[PDB]
Amino acid sequence: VKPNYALKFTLAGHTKAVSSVKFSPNGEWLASSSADKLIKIWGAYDGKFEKTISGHKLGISDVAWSSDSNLLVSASDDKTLKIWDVSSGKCLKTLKGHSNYVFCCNFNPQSNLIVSGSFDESVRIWDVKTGKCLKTLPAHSDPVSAVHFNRDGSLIVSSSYDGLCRIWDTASGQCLKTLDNPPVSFVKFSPNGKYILAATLDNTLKLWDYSKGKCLKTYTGHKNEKYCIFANFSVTGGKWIVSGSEDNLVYIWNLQTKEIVQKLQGHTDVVISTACHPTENIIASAALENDKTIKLWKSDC
Amino acid sequence: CRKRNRS
């Protein structure tokens, strides 16, 4: 009915706000990115610090794992993305082309492509092996807050401060669908690729039927008017929605009933990022400048 | 720039 997430570890080491935490697909690691220009790798089950990955010239807003857990991609204010070998920490490629801060990034399931979104209002699609920009999409009219592939890679969902969520055909880069118009600050596909979870800067999360173009669920009670906060589907136990919040809490909702089932207290600044572990009932949360830590929380369900 | 409130 309800989870019982409790704090198990606090991970200190970034020296500015943490922007994004992500678990590796194989469950072994947590990657964190920060405004301190660094990526840090931590053991997912014990919080053990593994390594620092460095090379960006300005802060990082997002980090993402390849399907096989062997590569990372980071999005920076230095207008580049970087592809990293996680084992060696080496920068394999630098993706140049955006003309402003790169804010969000993701591999496709094949992990032959990276998608990125930027303050320059475009979405770019990149070749992992060569590092070349395959396609530039004039996707929005304000900064692009989030980009995500669906489970077979055939679609990209993007969101923007312009108020729009759009679905793009990966192969052709053409728009398939556009969904008050408050800024859309986060979006991602559900695991089954049937739904899209969208955050808007009016303190609201919404679950959309992609094909139907209709809103099925709305989740409220948290605070989100200012920052691009990540939101998640939690599927390892009970089916929850998880999000950070500008009141410094992690919120967990029952996906079906929309009821808040837990609020996790401990952070001392905006909880900008949360992530759900692929096999265990473990949440990672991270906060901005007044906090700068990552917390690992574990539940029985 | 995800750490900043954009206005």
mmCIF file of all heavy atoms in Angstrom, chain A residues 209-256, unseen atoms left out:
data_model
loop_
_atom_site.group_PDB
_atom_site.id
_atom_site.type_symbol
_atom_site.label_atom_id
_atom_site.label_comp_id
_atom_site.label_asym_id
_atom_site.label_seq_id
_atom_site.Cartn_x
_atom_site.Cartn_y
_atom_site.Cartn_z
ATOM 1 N N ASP A 209 -1.460 9.922 -21.797
ATOM 2 C CA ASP A 209 -1.550 8.889 -22.829
ATOM 3 C C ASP A 209 -0.977 9.490 -24.104
ATOM 4 O O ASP A 209 -1.572 10.401 -24.662
ATOM 5 C CB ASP A 209 -2.999 8.428 -23.017
ATOM 6 C CG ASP A 209 -3.115 7.224 -23.966
ATOM 7 O OD1 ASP A 209 -2.836 7.395 -25.157
ATOM 8 O OD2 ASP A 209 -3.486 6.124 -23.495
ATOM 9 N N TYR A 210 0.221 9.050 -24.513
ATOM 10 C CA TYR A 210 0.878 9.611 -25.695
ATOM 11 C C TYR A 210 -0.045 9.524 -26.922
ATOM 12 O O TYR A 210 -0.388 10.542 -27.528
ATOM 13 C CB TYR A 210 2.230 8.911 -25.942
ATOM 14 C CG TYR A 210 2.666 9.014 -27.386
ATOM 15 C CD1 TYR A 210 2.483 10.197 -28.091
ATOM 16 C CD2 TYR A 210 3.136 7.908 -28.090
ATOM 17 C CE1 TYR A 210 2.781 10.295 -29.422
ATOM 18 C CE2 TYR A 210 3.450 8.002 -29.444
ATOM 19 C CZ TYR A 210 3.276 9.199 -30.099
ATOM 20 O OH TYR A 210 3.559 9.359 -31.418
ATOM 21 N N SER A 211 -0.439 8.308 -27.322
ATOM 22 C CA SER A 211 -1.225 8.149 -28.553
ATOM 23 C C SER A 211 -2.574 8.848 -28.443
ATOM 24 O O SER A 211 -3.060 9.444 -29.421
ATOM 25 C CB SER A 211 -1.429 6.686 -28.897
ATOM 26 O OG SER A 211 -2.206 6.574 -30.084
ATOM 27 N N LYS A 212 -3.208 8.758 -27.263
ATOM 28 C CA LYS A 212 -4.520 9.361 -27.074
ATOM 29 C C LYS A 212 -4.449 10.881 -26.964
ATOM 30 O O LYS A 212 -5.436 11.560 -27.245
ATOM 31 N N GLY A 213 -3.309 11.440 -26.559
ATOM 32 C CA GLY A 213 -3.235 12.881 -26.373
ATOM 33 C C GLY A 213 -4.032 13.414 -25.198
ATOM 34 O O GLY A 213 -4.396 14.594 -25.191
ATOM 35 N N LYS A 214 -4.315 12.569 -24.204
ATOM 36 C CA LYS A 214 -5.129 12.920 -23.052
ATOM 37 C C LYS A 214 -4.365 12.698 -21.752
ATOM 38 O O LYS A 214 -3.497 11.827 -21.654
ATOM 39 C CB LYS A 214 -6.423 12.091 -22.990
ATOM 40 C CG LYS A 214 -6.204 10.590 -23.089
ATOM 41 C CD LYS A 214 -6.664 10.072 -24.450
ATOM 42 N N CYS A 215 -4.741 13.472 -20.743
ATOM 43 C CA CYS A 215 -4.138 13.394 -19.421
ATOM 44 C C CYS A 215 -4.916 12.412 -18.558
ATOM 45 O O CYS A 215 -6.122 12.586 -18.345
ATOM 46 C CB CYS A 215 -4.121 14.781 -18.788
ATOM 47 S SG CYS A 215 -3.518 14.796 -17.110
ATOM 48 N N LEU A 216 -4.224 11.403 -18.040
ATOM 49 C CA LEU A 216 -4.835 10.335 -17.258
ATOM 50 C C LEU A 216 -4.758 10.547 -15.755
ATOM 51 O O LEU A 216 -5.672 10.128 -15.032
ATOM 52 C CB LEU A 216 -4.150 9.008 -17.596
ATOM 53 C CG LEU A 216 -4.207 8.598 -19.069
ATOM 54 C CD1 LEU A 216 -3.726 7.165 -19.259
ATOM 55 C CD2 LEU A 216 -5.623 8.785 -19.620
ATOM 56 N N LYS A 217 -3.674 11.145 -15.267
ATOM 57 C CA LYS A 217 -3.394 11.296 -13.848
ATOM 58 C C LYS A 217 -2.708 12.639 -13.641
ATOM 59 O O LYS A 217 -1.947 13.098 -14.500
ATOM 60 C CB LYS A 217 -2.492 10.171 -13.291
ATOM 61 C CG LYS A 217 -2.978 8.730 -13.519
ATOM 62 C CD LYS A 217 -4.195 8.390 -12.660
ATOM 63 C CE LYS A 217 -4.700 6.971 -12.992
ATOM 64 N NZ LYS A 217 -5.867 6.628 -12.160
ATOM 65 N N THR A 218 -2.977 13.263 -12.504
ATOM 66 C CA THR A 218 -2.226 14.434 -12.068
ATOM 67 C C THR A 218 -1.806 14.219 -10.622
ATOM 68 O O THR A 218 -2.531 13.597 -9.837
ATOM 69 C CB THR A 218 -3.016 15.742 -12.174
ATOM 70 O OG1 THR A 218 -3.787 15.931 -10.978
ATOM 71 C CG2 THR A 218 -3.909 15.734 -13.421
ATOM 72 N N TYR A 219 -0.607 14.686 -10.295
ATOM 73 C CA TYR A 219 0.027 14.484 -9.002
ATOM 74 C C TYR A 219 0.419 15.858 -8.494
ATOM 75 O O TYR A 219 1.076 16.624 -9.212
ATOM 76 C CB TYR A 219 1.242 13.544 -9.114
ATOM 77 C CG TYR A 219 0.929 12.264 -9.840
ATOM 78 C CD1 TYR A 219 1.101 12.161 -11.202
ATOM 79 C CD2 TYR A 219 0.446 11.160 -9.161
ATOM 80 C CE1 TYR A 219 0.798 10.999 -11.879
ATOM 81 C CE2 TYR A 219 0.140 9.995 -9.825
ATOM 82 C CZ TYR A 219 0.310 9.927 -11.188
ATOM 83 O OH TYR A 219 0.029 8.777 -11.899
ATOM 84 N N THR A 220 -0.048 16.189 -7.300
ATOM 85 C CA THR A 220 0.223 17.486 -6.711
ATOM 86 C C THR A 220 0.513 17.324 -5.227
ATOM 87 O O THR A 220 0.372 16.245 -4.640
ATOM 88 C CB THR A 220 -0.942 18.463 -6.908
ATOM 89 O OG1 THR A 220 -2.080 18.006 -6.174
ATOM 90 C CG2 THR A 220 -1.306 18.609 -8.383
ATOM 91 N N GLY A 221 0.887 18.437 -4.605
ATOM 92 C CA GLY A 221 1.205 18.497 -3.191
ATOM 93 C C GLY A 221 2.608 18.977 -2.919
ATOM 94 O O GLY A 221 2.899 19.481 -1.818
ATOM 95 N N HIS A 222 3.474 18.871 -3.915
ATOM 96 C CA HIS A 222 4.843 19.314 -3.829
ATOM 97 C C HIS A 222 4.944 20.749 -4.344
ATOM 98 O O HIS A 222 3.946 21.392 -4.674
ATOM 99 C CB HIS A 222 5.707 18.346 -4.635
ATOM 100 C CG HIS A 222 5.417 18.390 -6.098
ATOM 101 N ND1 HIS A 222 4.145 18.291 -6.618
ATOM 102 C CD2 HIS A 222 6.247 18.527 -7.155
ATOM 103 C CE1 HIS A 222 4.205 18.377 -7.936
ATOM 104 N NE2 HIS A 222 5.470 18.528 -8.284
ATOM 105 N N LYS A 223 6.167 21.265 -4.423
ATOM 106 C CA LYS A 223 6.409 22.639 -4.839
ATOM 107 C C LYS A 223 7.345 22.597 -6.038
ATOM 108 O O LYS A 223 8.441 22.026 -5.967
ATOM 109 C CB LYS A 223 6.997 23.456 -3.675
ATOM 110 C CG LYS A 223 5.977 23.807 -2.543
ATOM 111 C CD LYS A 223 4.720 24.471 -3.086
ATOM 112 C CE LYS A 223 3.606 24.433 -2.060
ATOM 113 N NZ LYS A 223 2.829 23.175 -2.153
ATOM 114 N N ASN A 224 6.921 23.189 -7.143
ATOM 115 C CA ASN A 224 7.791 23.223 -8.330
ATOM 116 C C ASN A 224 7.321 24.367 -9.230
ATOM 117 O O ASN A 224 6.463 24.174 -10.091
ATOM 118 C CB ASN A 224 7.766 21.875 -9.042
ATOM 119 C CG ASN A 224 8.757 21.749 -10.185
ATOM 120 O OD1 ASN A 224 8.559 20.903 -11.068
ATOM 121 N ND2 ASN A 224 9.803 22.558 -10.190
ATOM 122 N N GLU A 225 7.929 25.534 -9.032
ATOM 123 C CA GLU A 225 7.667 26.736 -9.817
ATOM 124 C C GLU A 225 8.917 27.321 -10.435
ATOM 125 O O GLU A 225 8.806 28.253 -11.243
ATOM 126 C CB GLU A 225 7.013 27.813 -8.938
ATOM 127 C CG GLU A 225 5.589 27.510 -8.580
ATOM 128 C CD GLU A 225 4.966 28.518 -7.606
ATOM 129 O OE1 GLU A 225 5.678 29.394 -7.062
ATOM 130 O OE2 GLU A 225 3.748 28.406 -7.372
ATOM 131 N N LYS A 226 10.098 26.827 -10.064
ATOM 132 C CA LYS A 226 11.339 27.527 -10.366
ATOM 133 C C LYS A 226 12.397 26.700 -11.070
ATOM 134 O O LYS A 226 13.147 27.250 -11.871
ATOM 135 C CB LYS A 226 11.942 28.072 -9.036
ATOM 136 C CG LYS A 226 11.040 29.054 -8.270
ATOM 137 C CD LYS A 226 11.644 29.428 -6.927
ATOM 138 N N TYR A 227 12.505 25.408 -10.764
ATOM 139 C CA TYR A 227 13.625 24.607 -11.200
ATOM 140 C C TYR A 227 13.142 23.426 -12.034
ATOM 141 O O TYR A 227 12.001 22.968 -11.918
ATOM 142 C CB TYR A 227 14.438 24.092 -9.998
ATOM 143 C CG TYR A 227 15.035 25.190 -9.172
ATOM 144 C CD1 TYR A 227 14.375 25.657 -8.062
ATOM 145 C CD2 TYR A 227 16.244 25.766 -9.532
ATOM 146 C CE1 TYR A 227 14.895 26.671 -7.319
ATOM 147 C CE2 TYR A 227 16.784 26.773 -8.794
ATOM 148 C CZ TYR A 227 16.102 27.230 -7.689
ATOM 149 O OH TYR A 227 16.644 28.246 -6.924
ATOM 150 N N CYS A 228 14.038 22.929 -12.873
ATOM 151 C CA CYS A 228 13.750 21.733 -13.674
ATOM 152 C C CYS A 228 14.136 20.486 -12.876
ATOM 153 O O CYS A 228 15.283 20.008 -12.895
ATOM 154 C CB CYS A 228 14.474 21.808 -15.008
ATOM 155 S SG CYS A 228 13.851 23.119 -16.069
ATOM 156 N N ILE A 229 13.156 19.978 -12.122
ATOM 157 C CA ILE A 229 13.284 18.842 -11.210
ATOM 158 C C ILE A 229 12.933 17.546 -11.916
ATOM 159 O O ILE A 229 11.927 17.491 -12.573
ATOM 160 C CB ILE A 229 12.359 19.100 -10.021
ATOM 161 C CG1 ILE A 229 12.807 20.353 -9.288
ATOM 162 C CG2 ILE A 229 12.325 17.901 -9.087
ATOM 163 C CD1 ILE A 229 11.985 20.677 -8.072
ATOM 164 N N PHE A 230 13.747 16.521 -11.761
ATOM 165 C CA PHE A 230 13.490 15.216 -12.397
ATOM 166 C C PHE A 230 12.343 14.507 -11.664
ATOM 167 O O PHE A 230 12.143 14.738 -10.507
ATOM 168 C CB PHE A 230 14.727 14.327 -12.329
ATOM 169 C CG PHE A 230 15.887 14.784 -13.165
ATOM 170 C CD1 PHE A 230 16.725 15.772 -12.703
ATOM 171 C CD2 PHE A 230 16.141 14.213 -14.394
ATOM 172 C CE1 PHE A 230 17.817 16.174 -13.449
ATOM 173 C CE2 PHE A 230 17.249 14.592 -15.132
ATOM 174 C CZ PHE A 230 18.065 15.585 -14.655
ATOM 175 N N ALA A 231 11.577 13.713 -12.390
ATOM 176 C CA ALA A 231 10.503 12.867 -11.837
ATOM 177 C C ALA A 231 10.656 11.472 -12.450
ATOM 178 O O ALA A 231 11.416 11.288 -13.356
ATOM 179 C CB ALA A 231 9.142 13.460 -12.053
ATOM 180 N N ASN A 232 10.167 10.472 -11.736
ATOM 181 C CA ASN A 232 10.459 9.083 -12.043
ATOM 182 C C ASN A 232 9.227 8.223 -11.857
ATOM 183 O O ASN A 232 8.358 8.512 -11.037
ATOM 184 C CB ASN A 232 11.568 8.527 -11.125
ATOM 185 C CG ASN A 232 12.786 9.410 -11.058
ATOM 186 O OD1 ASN A 232 13.759 9.184 -11.759
ATOM 187 N ND2 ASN A 232 12.722 10.441 -10.243
ATOM 188 N N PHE A 233 9.192 7.134 -12.619
ATOM 189 C CA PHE A 233 8.385 5.964 -12.291
ATOM 190 C C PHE A 233 9.196 4.998 -11.422
ATOM 191 O O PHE A 233 10.302 4.612 -11.799
ATOM 192 C CB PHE A 233 7.942 5.216 -13.559
ATOM 193 C CG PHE A 233 7.128 6.048 -14.519
ATOM 194 C CD1 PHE A 233 7.745 6.939 -15.372
ATOM 195 C CD2 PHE A 233 5.754 5.914 -14.581
ATOM 196 C CE1 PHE A 233 7.006 7.724 -16.246
ATOM 197 C CE2 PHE A 233 5.004 6.695 -15.456
ATOM 198 C CZ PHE A 233 5.636 7.598 -16.293
ATOM 199 N N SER A 234 8.622 4.543 -10.311
ATOM 200 C CA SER A 234 9.242 3.531 -9.465
ATOM 201 C C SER A 234 8.461 2.242 -9.669
ATOM 202 O O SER A 234 7.243 2.219 -9.451
ATOM 203 C CB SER A 234 9.238 3.938 -7.990
ATOM 204 O OG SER A 234 9.751 2.880 -7.169
ATOM 205 N N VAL A 235 9.146 1.172 -10.079
ATOM 206 C CA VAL A 235 8.468 -0.043 -10.516
ATOM 207 C C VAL A 235 8.980 -1.303 -9.838
ATOM 208 O O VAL A 235 8.432 -2.383 -10.079
ATOM 209 C CB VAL A 235 8.564 -0.188 -12.051
ATOM 210 C CG1 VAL A 235 7.913 0.998 -12.764
ATOM 211 C CG2 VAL A 235 10.015 -0.327 -12.497
ATOM 212 N N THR A 236 10.001 -1.214 -8.984
ATOM 213 C CA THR A 236 10.607 -2.428 -8.443
ATOM 214 C C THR A 236 9.722 -3.077 -7.403
ATOM 215 O O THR A 236 9.806 -4.297 -7.198
ATOM 216 C CB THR A 236 11.962 -2.109 -7.835
ATOM 217 O OG1 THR A 236 11.840 -0.932 -7.023
ATOM 218 C CG2 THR A 236 12.972 -1.860 -8.939
ATOM 219 N N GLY A 237 8.921 -2.279 -6.705
ATOM 220 C CA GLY A 237 7.945 -2.765 -5.762
ATOM 221 C C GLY A 237 6.573 -2.229 -6.112
ATOM 222 O O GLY A 237 6.018 -2.548 -7.169
ATOM 223 N N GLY A 238 6.028 -1.389 -5.245
ATOM 224 C CA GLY A 238 4.784 -0.712 -5.570
ATOM 225 C C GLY A 238 4.984 0.286 -6.696
ATOM 226 O O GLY A 238 6.085 0.791 -6.918
ATOM 227 N N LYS A 239 3.907 0.563 -7.432
ATOM 228 C CA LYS A 239 3.994 1.435 -8.604
ATOM 229 C C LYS A 239 3.784 2.868 -8.138
ATOM 230 O O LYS A 239 2.659 3.295 -7.852
ATOM 231 C CB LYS A 239 2.991 1.042 -9.679
ATOM 232 C CG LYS A 239 2.922 -0.450 -9.927
ATOM 233 C CD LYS A 239 4.273 -1.025 -10.357
ATOM 234 C CE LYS A 239 4.090 -2.394 -11.017
ATOM 235 N NZ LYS A 239 5.168 -2.685 -11.985
ATOM 236 N N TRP A 240 4.887 3.594 -8.023
ATOM 237 C CA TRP A 240 4.866 4.958 -7.523
ATOM 238 C C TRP A 240 5.352 5.958 -8.570
ATOM 239 O O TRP A 240 6.046 5.622 -9.533
ATOM 240 C CB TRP A 240 5.761 5.121 -6.271
ATOM 241 C CG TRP A 240 5.816 3.961 -5.330
ATOM 242 C CD1 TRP A 240 6.913 3.202 -5.024
ATOM 243 C CD2 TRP A 240 4.743 3.453 -4.531
ATOM 244 N NE1 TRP A 240 6.576 2.229 -4.103
ATOM 245 C CE2 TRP A 240 5.251 2.370 -3.782
ATOM 246 C CE3 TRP A 240 3.399 3.793 -4.389
ATOM 247 C CZ2 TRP A 240 4.466 1.637 -2.902
ATOM 248 C CZ3 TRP A 240 2.616 3.054 -3.502
ATOM 249 C CH2 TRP A 240 3.156 1.993 -2.775
ATOM 250 N N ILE A 241 5.025 7.222 -8.319
ATOM 251 C CA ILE A 241 5.676 8.376 -8.940
ATOM 252 C C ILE A 241 6.556 9.024 -7.874
ATOM 253 O O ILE A 241 6.118 9.186 -6.729
ATOM 254 C CB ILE A 241 4.646 9.391 -9.463
ATOM 255 C CG1 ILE A 241 3.727 8.731 -10.491
ATOM 256 C CG2 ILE A 241 5.343 10.635 -10.040
ATOM 257 C CD1 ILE A 241 4.409 8.348 -11.741
ATOM 258 N N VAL A 242 7.789 9.384 -8.245
ATOM 259 C CA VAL A 242 8.757 9.979 -7.327
ATOM 260 C C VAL A 242 9.243 11.289 -7.934
ATOM 261 O O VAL A 242 9.553 11.345 -9.131
ATOM 262 C CB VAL A 242 9.955 9.029 -7.077
ATOM 263 C CG1 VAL A 242 11.014 9.681 -6.164
ATOM 264 C CG2 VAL A 242 9.470 7.709 -6.518
ATOM 265 N N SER A 243 9.365 12.325 -7.104
ATOM 266 C CA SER A 243 9.882 13.609 -7.568
ATOM 267 C C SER A 243 10.516 14.340 -6.392
ATOM 268 O O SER A 243 10.070 14.203 -5.255
ATOM 269 C CB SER A 243 8.774 14.481 -8.181
ATOM 270 O OG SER A 243 9.262 15.771 -8.570
ATOM 271 N N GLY A 244 11.533 15.152 -6.683
ATOM 272 C CA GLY A 244 11.957 16.157 -5.729
ATOM 273 C C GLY A 244 10.993 17.320 -5.689
ATOM 274 O O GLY A 244 9.965 17.348 -6.356
ATOM 275 N N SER A 245 11.359 18.307 -4.894
ATOM 276 C CA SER A 245 10.459 19.412 -4.589
ATOM 277 C C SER A 245 11.253 20.583 -4.043
ATOM 278 O O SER A 245 12.319 20.408 -3.435
ATOM 279 C CB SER A 245 9.409 18.950 -3.582
ATOM 280 O OG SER A 245 8.539 19.995 -3.220
ATOM 281 N N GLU A 246 10.681 21.781 -4.230
ATOM 282 C CA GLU A 246 11.321 23.024 -3.802
ATOM 283 C C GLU A 246 11.091 23.331 -2.328
ATOM 284 O O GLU A 246 11.684 24.288 -1.831
ATOM 285 C CB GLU A 246 10.858 24.179 -4.716
ATOM 286 C CG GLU A 246 11.455 24.064 -6.140
ATOM 287 C CD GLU A 246 10.677 24.844 -7.217
ATOM 288 O OE1 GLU A 246 9.791 25.652 -6.879
ATOM 289 O OE2 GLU A 246 10.945 24.643 -8.422
ATOM 290 N N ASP A 247 10.311 22.517 -1.608
ATOM 291 C CA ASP A 247 10.282 22.517 -0.151
ATOM 292 C C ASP A 247 11.259 21.504 0.457
ATOM 293 O O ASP A 247 11.122 21.144 1.628
ATOM 294 C CB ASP A 247 8.846 22.291 0.358
ATOM 295 C CG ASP A 247 8.248 20.958 -0.070
ATOM 296 O OD1 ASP A 247 8.955 20.179 -0.710
ATOM 297 O OD2 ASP A 247 7.058 20.712 0.247
ATOM 298 N N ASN A 248 12.252 21.048 -0.315
ATOM 299 C CA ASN A 248 13.379 20.245 0.163
ATOM 300 C C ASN A 248 13.014 18.801 0.492
ATOM 301 O O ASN A 248 13.807 18.115 1.163
ATOM 302 C CB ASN A 248 14.063 20.844 1.402
ATOM 303 C CG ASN A 248 14.494 22.273 1.193
ATOM 304 O OD1 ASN A 248 14.476 22.781 0.077
ATOM 305 N ND2 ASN A 248 14.899 22.937 2.280
ATOM 306 N N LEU A 249 11.854 18.329 0.049
ATOM 307 C CA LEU A 249 11.383 16.972 0.281
ATOM 308 C C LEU A 249 11.391 16.175 -1.012
ATOM 309 O O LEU A 249 11.372 16.739 -2.108
ATOM 310 C CB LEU A 249 9.968 16.975 0.861
ATOM 311 C CG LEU A 249 9.762 17.822 2.111
ATOM 312 C CD1 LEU A 249 8.295 17.844 2.511
ATOM 313 C CD2 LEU A 249 10.638 17.241 3.206
ATOM 314 N N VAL A 250 11.477 14.851 -0.856
ATOM 315 C CA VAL A 250 11.169 13.898 -1.917
ATOM 316 C C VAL A 250 9.733 13.447 -1.700
ATOM 317 O O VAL A 250 9.370 13.018 -0.596
ATOM 318 C CB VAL A 250 12.121 12.689 -1.892
ATOM 319 C CG1 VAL A 250 11.691 11.651 -2.907
ATOM 320 C CG2 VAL A 250 13.572 13.088 -2.159
ATOM 321 N N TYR A 251 8.915 13.553 -2.748
ATOM 322 C CA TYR A 251 7.526 13.138 -2.738
ATOM 323 C C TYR A 251 7.378 11.831 -3.502
ATOM 324 O O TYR A 251 8.033 11.618 -4.529
ATOM 325 C CB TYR A 251 6.640 14.197 -3.394
ATOM 326 C CG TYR A 251 6.330 15.370 -2.515
ATOM 327 C CD1 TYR A 251 7.296 16.307 -2.224
ATOM 328 C CD2 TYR A 251 5.073 15.539 -1.991
ATOM 329 C CE1 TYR A 251 7.023 17.376 -1.441
ATOM 330 C CE2 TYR A 251 4.791 16.601 -1.205
ATOM 331 C CZ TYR A 251 5.775 17.504 -0.912
ATOM 332 O OH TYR A 251 5.461 18.570 -0.105
ATOM 333 N N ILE A 252 6.516 10.960 -2.973
ATOM 334 C CA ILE A 252 6.210 9.666 -3.562
ATOM 335 C C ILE A 252 4.700 9.574 -3.609
ATOM 336 O O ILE A 252 4.036 9.781 -2.577
ATOM 337 C CB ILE A 252 6.811 8.515 -2.738
ATOM 338 C CG1 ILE A 252 8.313 8.757 -2.565
ATOM 339 C CG2 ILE A 252 6.499 7.191 -3.406
ATOM 340 C CD1 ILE A 252 9.023 7.681 -1.764
ATOM 341 N N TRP A 253 4.157 9.328 -4.799
ATOM 342 C CA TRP A 253 2.724 9.178 -4.981
ATOM 343 C C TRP A 253 2.384 7.764 -5.449
ATOM 344 O O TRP A 253 3.168 7.099 -6.139
ATOM 345 C CB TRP A 253 2.164 10.164 -6.016
ATOM 346 C CG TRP A 253 2.228 11.634 -5.756
ATOM 347 C CD1 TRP A 253 1.234 12.420 -5.272
ATOM 348 C CD2 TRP A 253 3.312 12.513 -6.072
ATOM 349 N NE1 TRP A 253 1.631 13.731 -5.236
ATOM 350 C CE2 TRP A 253 2.906 13.816 -5.724
ATOM 351 C CE3 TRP A 253 4.587 12.325 -6.605
ATOM 352 C CZ2 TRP A 253 3.715 14.920 -5.896
ATOM 353 C CZ3 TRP A 253 5.395 13.433 -6.772
ATOM 354 C CH2 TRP A 253 4.961 14.708 -6.401
ATOM 355 N N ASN A 254 1.188 7.306 -5.066
ATOM 356 C CA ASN A 254 0.587 6.119 -5.659
ATOM 357 C C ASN A 254 0.195 6.462 -7.094
ATOM 358 O O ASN A 254 -0.584 7.390 -7.324
ATOM 359 C CB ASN A 254 -0.612 5.683 -4.807
ATOM 360 C CG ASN A 254 -1.283 4.441 -5.335
ATOM 361 O OD1 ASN A 254 -1.647 4.393 -6.487
ATOM 362 N ND2 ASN A 254 -1.490 3.444 -4.469
ATOM 363 N N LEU A 255 0.783 5.758 -8.070
ATOM 364 C CA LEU A 255 0.584 6.130 -9.468
ATOM 365 C C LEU A 255 -0.893 6.101 -9.847
ATOM 366 O O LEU A 255 -1.367 6.953 -10.608
ATOM 367 C CB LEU A 255 1.383 5.193 -10.378
ATOM 368 C CG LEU A 255 1.382 5.547 -11.862
ATOM 369 C CD1 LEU A 255 2.646 5.041 -12.567
ATOM 370 C CD2 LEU A 255 0.137 5.010 -12.550
ATOM 371 N N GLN A 256 -1.623 5.103 -9.356
ATOM 372 C CA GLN A 256 -3.006 4.927 -9.782
ATOM 373 C C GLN A 256 -3.953 5.858 -9.045
ATOM 374 O O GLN A 256 -4.843 6.452 -9.656
ATOM 375 C CB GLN A 256 -3.459 3.483 -9.568
ATOM 376 C CG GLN A 256 -2.763 2.475 -10.465
ATOM 377 C CD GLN A 256 -2.962 2.750 -11.946
ATOM 378 O OE1 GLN A 256 -3.841 3.517 -12.349
ATOM 379 N NE2 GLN A 256 -2.146 2.109 -12.767
#
